């Protein structure tokens with residue numbers, strides 16, 4: 039029980055400090071936002 | 087009120103509201119990060 043409590047306490051730090059993952063969700067958000075931004079920026083092209 | 091506006095040849099449709107944007111004296115209209123017109127200057131009243 040003590041070991042589990044210590045590890046679950048360390049989780050709250052290691053989730054955002056060690057990074058590794060949790061960049062996947064932000065990557066999904068960034069990809070979608072960038073795709074929408076590119077789509078709405080393509081309206082300024084004359085295309086000839 | 088949503089209207090068809092013709093500001094000195096610039097034709098568009100939308101509602102025109104009072105703006106907190108502070109145009110520099112040489113600036114005539116404002117654009118958004120994706121090159122969409124966000125603001126205009128009234129030729130008569132010099133209003134943003």
Ligand SMILES: *[C@@H]1O[C@H](CO)[C@@H](O)[C@H](O)[C@H]1NC(C)=O
Nearest residue numbers: 094127128129130131132133
């Ligand atoms: C047009 O006339 C108005 C008053 O009727 C004046 O306030 C405005 O500055 C004038 N616009 C100019 C000179 O561009």
